[PDB]
Design a protein around this motif. Structure first.
Motif, PDB file in Angstrom:
ATOM      1  N   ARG A 243      14.535  18.483  -2.526  1.00  0.00           N
ATOM      2  CA  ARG A 243      13.855  17.395  -1.827  1.00  0.00           C
ATOM      3  C   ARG A 243      13.227  17.873  -0.523  1.00  0.00           C
ATOM      4  O   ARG A 243      12.091  17.502  -0.203  1.00  0.00           O
TER       5      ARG A 243
ATOM      6  N   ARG B  11      16.262   9.761  -8.167  1.00  0.00           N
ATOM      7  CA  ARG B  11      14.986   9.065  -8.025  1.00  0.00           C
ATOM      8  C   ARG B  11      13.884  10.062  -7.694  1.00  0.00           C
ATOM      9  O   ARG B  11      14.122  11.264  -7.548  1.00  0.00           O
ATOM     10  N   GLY B  12      12.670   9.534  -7.571  1.00  0.00           N
ATOM     11  CA  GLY B  12      11.468  10.340  -7.545  1.00  0.00           C
ATOM     12  C   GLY B  12      11.258  11.112  -6.253  1.00  0.00           C
ATOM     13  O   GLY B  12      12.098  11.157  -5.354  1.00  0.00           O
ATOM     14  N   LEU B  13      10.086  11.748  -6.185  1.00  0.00           N
ATOM     15  CA  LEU B  13       9.669  12.622  -5.089  1.00  0.00           C
ATOM     16  C   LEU B  13      10.596  13.823  -4.923  1.00  0.00           C
ATOM     17  O   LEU B  13      10.663  14.416  -3.841  1.00  0.00           O
TER      18      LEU B  13
ATOM     19  N   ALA C 290      -4.339   4.692   5.282  1.00  0.00           N
ATOM     20  CA  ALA C 290      -3.314   4.790   4.249  1.00  0.00           C
ATOM     21  C   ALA C 290      -2.730   6.195   4.178  1.00  0.00           C
ATOM     22  O   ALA C 290      -1.508   6.363   4.095  1.00  0.00           O
TER      23      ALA C 290
ATOM     24  N   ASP D   7       0.822  -1.205   0.000  1.00  0.00           N
ATOM     25  CA  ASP D   7       0.000   0.000   0.000  1.00  0.00           C
ATOM     26  C   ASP D   7       0.859   1.259   0.000  1.00  0.00           C
ATOM     27  O   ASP D   7       0.503   2.256  -0.636  1.00  0.00           O
ATOM     28  N   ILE D   8       1.986   1.231   0.717  1.00  0.00           N
ATOM     29  CA  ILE D   8       2.915   2.358   0.680  1.00  0.00           C
ATOM     30  C   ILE D   8       3.453   2.556  -0.733  1.00  0.00           C
ATOM     31  O   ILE D   8       3.626   3.692  -1.195  1.00  0.00           O
TER      32      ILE D   8
ATOM     33  N   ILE E 279       5.335   8.685   6.640  1.00  0.00           N
ATOM     34  CA  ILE E 279       6.520   8.342   5.859  1.00  0.00           C
ATOM     35  C   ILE E 279       7.101   9.587   5.196  1.00  0.00           C
ATOM     36  O   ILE E 279       8.324   9.775   5.156  1.00  0.00           O
TER      37      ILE E 279
ATOM     38  N   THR F  45       1.162   7.124   4.972  1.00  0.00           N
ATOM     39  CA  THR F  45       1.936   7.784   3.927  1.00  0.00           C
ATOM     40  C   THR F  45       2.425   9.152   4.387  1.00  0.00           C
ATOM     41  O   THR F  45       3.560   9.541   4.096  1.00  0.00           O
TER      42      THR F  45
ATOM     43  N   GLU G 261      11.957   4.340  -4.279  1.00  0.00           N
ATOM     44  CA  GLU G 261      12.236   5.143  -3.094  1.00  0.00           C
ATOM     45  C   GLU G 261      12.344   4.271  -1.851  1.00  0.00           C
ATOM     46  O   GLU G 261      13.104   4.595  -0.931  1.00  0.00           O
TER      47      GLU G 261
ATOM     48  N   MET H 249      10.757  11.302   5.565  1.00  0.00           N
ATOM     49  CA  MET H 249      11.582  11.744   4.447  1.00  0.00           C
ATOM     50  C   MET H 249      12.006  13.192   4.640  1.00  0.00           C
ATOM     51  O   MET H 249      13.159  13.558   4.372  1.00  0.00           O
TER      52      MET H 249
ATOM     53  N   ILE I 121       1.848   5.033  -3.429  1.00  0.00           N
ATOM     54  CA  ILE I 121       2.063   6.475  -3.405  1.00  0.00           C
ATOM     55  C   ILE I 121       3.548   6.820  -3.424  1.00  0.00           C
ATOM     56  O   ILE I 121       3.990   7.671  -4.204  1.00  0.00           O
ATOM     57  N   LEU I 122       4.339   6.159  -2.576  1.00  0.00           N
ATOM     58  CA  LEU I 122       5.741   6.535  -2.427  1.00  0.00           C
ATOM     59  C   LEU I 122       6.579   6.177  -3.649  1.00  0.00           C
ATOM     60  O   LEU I 122       7.684   6.708  -3.800  1.00  0.00           O
TER      61      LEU I 122
END
Lengths: 234, 154, 113, 194
Positions: free
Chosen positions: D150, D59-61, D11, B67-68, D18, D15, B76, D22, B71-72
Motif C-alpha cells: 500500500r 480493499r482496493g488501491l 478534482a 467526485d472523490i 487524498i 484526489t 475506501e 493515504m 477515483i478513490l
C-alpha cells in the motif's frame, strides 16, 4: 463599486474612445485611484481627522485573475475575498483566512488582542490546510484536529448581533487558553452567548478595566470568571 | 454579461442545470444556487429554517465526496462518509415531482402536496424512517405517502 | 555560480550546501510524523548537520538596532568560504545549534557558544 | 471547454491530496506493523525451537498485491480456504472458509506475499501449537507486506498528478491568451470598421 466600470464603459464607448483589453479603456487605474487615494489619517498641520473606506468589487464565479479585480487589488492595503462554496459550510460572512491578509495589521489593535492572536493562528492556519485530507485517518495530531474544529465552530455568528470589542477579546482568550474545548461541537453556539449573559451577572470590573486602559486585566483574576462559569454550565 | 446584469433585480432566483436535465430527475432545479429573501426567521418561522439549512448543507457536502468516489473507489471511504451519500441520494431523488401539465410527456395525472407536508416529509427523510426503501422508488412522486405505495407496487 | 567564475573550492562548497539540504527538505515529512531516534545513521547525520545550516543563515544587521540592540556585523567574502567549508566537514558540529542565530562571523559564533 | 479543465484541475488536486494522506497514514501504520511483527519474531523462533490457502488485501488501491498471488496459486493448482473479500470475489468469478475483516494488526500448502520492507513482494509457497505458530507467523508477514505494498501504491500514485496539473494549467493559460487575443481582435476590427 465595479458598476462604475460599466457606466464608464458605456459612455466611453459611446464617445468613441479607443477600446482596451475587455473594452475597458486604460483610464480605469486613474479613475479608481483619483478617488481611492483620498482616504488618509491627516497630520496636525491641517487637522487631526481620519477617514476609512471599504470598496466593493463584483466577480464572476471567483475568477480573481480578472482585469478589474487585479486592478483594484493593487491599490488597497489588503483584501477580503468572500468564497461561495464555503458560504454553505456554516461560517458567515464567508471570510477565508488563507486569501486575506492585512499589511497594516498588527498595530491597530487593543493590546488585549495582540497578546493572544498568535495561538489562534497556530491552531487555525494549520487546520485550514490540514483538514481537507487529514480528517479521515482516526495524540498530538488528533488534538490539533479537534481543537481546530472547535475554533472554526466558535468563530461563527448569527444574523445581526454585533458584539463590543471587550467581549470579543474575552471569548478569544477563553478559546485560546484551552479552557473551552470541553463543550461539544454543536453546543458551542449556545455557550458563546450564555458566557455573554454570565459575565454581566458576574461583574463589570473586568469590562471597565478593558474599557479604560485598553489592556488585558490580571490573568489570575481573569481566569476566575471562566472557572466559576464552568462549574455551572449545562 | 447578460445573466450578470439580470441577476441584480430578482428577489428570488431558481437555477436549472442541464446536468439535472440529463439525470432524469425533473424538475432540474439545483438546490445549491437557488436563493430567496424569504429565508428569514420572521417570515417562514423556525420550523422551516433548520430543516432547509440541514438539507442544503448535506447536499453541498455530498457534492465533493461524490467526485472523490469517482477515483478513490466506493469502500475506501469510511462508512460514516458513505452514509452521507446513502442519504443524499434519497434526498435528491425525493426532490422530483409528478406534474399535472406534463401528462402528455408522463402519461400520468400527478399528485398534490401542501407546504406542511413538504417540511414534514423532509423531517422524516432526515429522521431515518426510510433507509430501507429503494432509491428508484422516489423518482417522480408527490406526497411522501405515495412512496410506501410505490414500494408496495414493486 | 560556475567554477570558472568562483573557483573550484567555492563552487564545491556552494553546490554541496544545496545538495545536502535536499535530504532534510525531503525527510521533514516523515520526521514530522515519526521520531528520529529509530531511523538510520544517515537520517541522523542529515538532521544533525541540517539543523546547523538552517540556523547559520541568520545575521544581525545595522538597521536591526532600533528594535533589537546589536552592534551589527559583517561577513567577509574570503572568510565565508572557509567558514562554510569548516561547517560542512563537521568541525563545528559540537556547538549548540540555536547559538548559531543572528551573527555574521564564525569566530563570534565560537565566542558566543 | 475551459470549465472542463478547471474542474479537472480541482478534482485532480483534491484526489492527489487524498492520496498523499493515504500515503502518510500507510507509512505510519507500516512502521508500527513492522515493529509488531519484529517483536513477535522471537516468540515464533523460541516456540519453533522447543488443500490450499490464499490470502489477499481487504480493499482496493493496494496495487499489484492482489493479482500476483491469485494468479500463481491458480496456475500451480490447475497445472497438476481464502482470507480477504477480493479473494472471495476472485472465486465468485470463475468457479472454485471466508474469514474476513479481521482488525488491523490482528491478535492471535500456504501461498502468501512474503515480507520485505522496501519495494518488492515475493510470492512464496510453504501439533495445534505448531500449526498456530506457523499460520500466525505467515499472516503477520502477509499483513506487513500488505502495508508495504500500500505504501508503494500511494507513492507511485501521488506523482503523475503534479505533471497532469502542470500541463492542464499550461493549457489553461494558453486558452486564456487565445480567448483574450480573439476578443481584442474582434473588438478592434469592429472599431476600425465603425
Amino acid at each position: 463599486l465595479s458598476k462604475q466600470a460599466a457606466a464608464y464603459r458605456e459612455l466611453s464607448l459611446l464617445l468613441r474612445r479607443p477600446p482596451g483589453r475587455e473594452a475597458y479603456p486604460g483610464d480605469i487605474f486613474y479613475l479608481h485611484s483619483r478617488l481611492l487615494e483620498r482616504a488618509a489619517k491627516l497630520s496636525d498641520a491641517k487637522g487631526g481627522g481620519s477617514l476609512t473606506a471599504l470598496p466593493f468589487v463584483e466577480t464572476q464565479a471567483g475568477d480573481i485573475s480578472a482585469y478589474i479585480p487585479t486592478n483594484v487589488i493593487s491599490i488597497t492595503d489588503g483584501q477580503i475575498f468572500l468564497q461561495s462554496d464555503l458560504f454553505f459550510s456554516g461560517v458567515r460572512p464567508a471570510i477565508n483566512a488563507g486569501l486575506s491578509v492585512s499589511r497594516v495589521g498588527g498595530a491597530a489593535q487593543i493590546k488585549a488582542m495582540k497578546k493572544v492572536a498568535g495561538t489562534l493562528r497556530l491552531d487555525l492556519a494549520a487546520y485550514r490546510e490540514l483538514e481537507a485530507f487529514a480528517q479521515f485517518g482516526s495524540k498530538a495530531t488528533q488534538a490539533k484536529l479537534a481543537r481546530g474544529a472547535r475554533t472554526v465552530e466558535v468563530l461563527k455568528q448569527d444574523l445581526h448581533q454585533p458584539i463590543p470589542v471587550e467581549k470579543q477579546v474575552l471569548i478569544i482568550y477563553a478559546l485560546t487558553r484551552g479552557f473551552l474545548d470541553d463543550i461539544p461541537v454543536e453546543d458551542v453556539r449556545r455557550f458563546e452567548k450564555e458566557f455573554y449573559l454570565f459575565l454581566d451577572q458576574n461583574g463589570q470590573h473586568l469590562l471597565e478595566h478593558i474599557r479604560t486602559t485598553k489592556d488585558l486585566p490580571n490573568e489570575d483574576d481573569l481566569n476566575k470568571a471562566i472557572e466559576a462559569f464552568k462549574k455551572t454550565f449545562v | 454579461p447578460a445573466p450578470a446584469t439580470t441577476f441584480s433585480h430578482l428577489d428570488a432566483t431558481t437555477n436549472l442545470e442541464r446536468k439535472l436535465a440529463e439525470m432524469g430527475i425533473y424538475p432540474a432545479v439545483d438546490p445549491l444556487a437557488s436563493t430567496s429573501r424569504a429565508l428569514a426567521p420572521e417570515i417562514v418561522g423556525e420550523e422551516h429554517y433548520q430543516v432547509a439549512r440541514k438539507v442544503q448543507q448535506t447536499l453541498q457536502r455530498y457534492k465533493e465526496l461524490q467526485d472523490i468516489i469517482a477515483i478513490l473507489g466506493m469502500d475506501e471511504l469510511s462508512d460514516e462518509d458513505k452514509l452521507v451519500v446513502h442519504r443524499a441520494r434519497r434526498i435528491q431523488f425525493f426532490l422530483s415531482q409528478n406534474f399535472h401539465v406534463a401528462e402528455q410527456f408522463t402519461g400520468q395525472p400527478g399528485s398534490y402536496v401542501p407546504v406542511k407536508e413538504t417540511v414534514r416529509g423532509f423531517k422524516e427523510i432526515l429522521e431515518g424512517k426510510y433507509d430501507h426503501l429503494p432509491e428508484d422508488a422516489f423518482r417522480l412522486v408527490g406526497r411522501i405517502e405515495e412512496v410506501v405505495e410505490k414500494a408496495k407496487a414493486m | 555560480l560556475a567554477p570558472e567564475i568562483v573557483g573550484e573550492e567555492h563552487y564545491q562548497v556552494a553546490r554541496k550546501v544545496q545538495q545536502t539540504l535536499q535530504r532534510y527538505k525531503e525527510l521533514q515529512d516523515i520526521i514530522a510524523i515519526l521520531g528520529m531516534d529509530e531511523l538510520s545513521d544517515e537520517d541522523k547525520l542529515v538532521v544533525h548537520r541540517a539543523r546547523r545550516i538552517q540556523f547559520f543563515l541568520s545575521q544581525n544587521f545595522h538597521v536591526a538596532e532600533q528594535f533589537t540592540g546589536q552592534p551589527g556585523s559583517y561577513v567577509p567574502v574570503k572568510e565565508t568560504v572557509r567558514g562554510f567549508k569548516e561547517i560542512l566537514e563537521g568541525k563545528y558540529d559540537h556547538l549548540p545549534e540555536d547559538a548559531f542565530r543572528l551573527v555574521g562571523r564564525i569566530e563570534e559564533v565560537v565566542e558566543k557558544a | 471547454s475551459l470549465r472542463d479543465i478547471k474542474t479537472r484541475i480541482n478534482a485532480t488536486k483534491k484526489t492527489s491530496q487524498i492520496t498523499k494522506a493515504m500515503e502518510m497514514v500507510s507509512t505510519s501504520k507500516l512502521n508500527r506493523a513492522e515493529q509488531n511483527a519484529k517483536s513477535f519474531v522471537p516468540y515464533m523462533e523460541k516456540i519453533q525451537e522447543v488443500g490450499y490457502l490464499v490470502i489477499t488485501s481487504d480493499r482496493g488501491l493496494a496495487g499489484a498485491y492482489n493479482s500476483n498471488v491469485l494468479r500463481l496459486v491458480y496456475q500451480t493448482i490447475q497445472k497438476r480456504i481464502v482470507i480477504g473479500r477480493v479473494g472471495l470475489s476472485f472465486f465468485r468469478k470463475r468457479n472454485m472458509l471466508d474469514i474476513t475483516r479481521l482488525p488491523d494488526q490482528p491478535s492471535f500448502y500456504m501461498y502468501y506475499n512474503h515480507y520485505v520492507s522496501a519495494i518488492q513482494q515475493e510470492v512464496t509457497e510453504r501439533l495445534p501449537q505448531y500449526a498456530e505458530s506457523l499460520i500466525y507467523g505467515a499472516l503477520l508477514d502477509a499483513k506487513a507486506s500488505e502495508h508495504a505494498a500500500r505504501m508503494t501504491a500511494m507513492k507511485n500514485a501521488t506523482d503523475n498528478a503534479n505533471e497532469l496539473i502542470r500541463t492542464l494549467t499550461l493549457s489553461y493559460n494558453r486558452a486564456r491568451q487565445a480567448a483574450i487575443t480573439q476578443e481584442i481582435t474582434e473588438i478592434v476590427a469592429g472599431a476600425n470598421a465603425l
